[PDB]
Amino acid sequence: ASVYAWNRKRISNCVADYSVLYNSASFSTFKCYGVSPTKLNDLCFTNVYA
Amino acid sequence: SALGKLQDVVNQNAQALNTLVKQLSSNFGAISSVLNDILSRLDPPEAEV
């Protein structure tokens, strides 16, 4: 979608695997604020917004 | 009410220790007030800040 009508997706009840995202080299920019990407696998979250 | 001079001595100490305990619940500008979450959520090169 366009910028002014950006979408938002609910994420819950997940065995989330962020290893595939970080290990992929297709992303030119991958910056995380407040969380280290390598530590994303250990943590648990109540809700995720995309 | 006669023993106030002896009771306040205990009261002041009780207040001081309590305020010392309360200081464990302050961020001081950091992202969390508990030391375990910082080490379990941030990279070693960054958590030192």
- Cα dihedral A23→A29→A35→A40 (10° resolution): -20
In angstroms, the separation between the Cα of residue A43 and the nearest Cα of chain B is 8
> Is A27:A35 a contact under the CB 8 Å cutoff?
no
| Residues belonging to chain B | 49
Determine the residue among A32, A36, A42, A45 to mutate to test chain B binding: the one whose Cβ has the most chain B Cβ atoms within 10 Å: A36
Q: How many helices (H) and strands (E) does chain B have?
A: 3, 0
**Could you give the count of Cα atoms lying within 13 Å of A45 in the half-sphere of its Cβ?**
16
Nearest CA in chain B to A36: B42
Separation between Cα atoms, residue A48 and residue A41, nearest integer Å: 14
Separation between Cα atoms, residue B25 and residue A46, nearest integer Å: 23
> Is B27:B33 a contact under the CB 8 Å cutoff?
yes
> Is B43:A36 a contact under the CB 8 Å cutoff?
yes
In angstroms, the separation between the Cα of residue A39 and the nearest Cα of chain B is 6
| Solved with | cryo-EM
Separation between Cα atoms, residue B38 and residue A35, nearest integer Å: 9
Amino acid sitting at position A28:
S
Dmax over Cα atoms in chain A, in whole Å?
34
> Is B16:B24 a contact under the CB 8 Å cutoff?
no
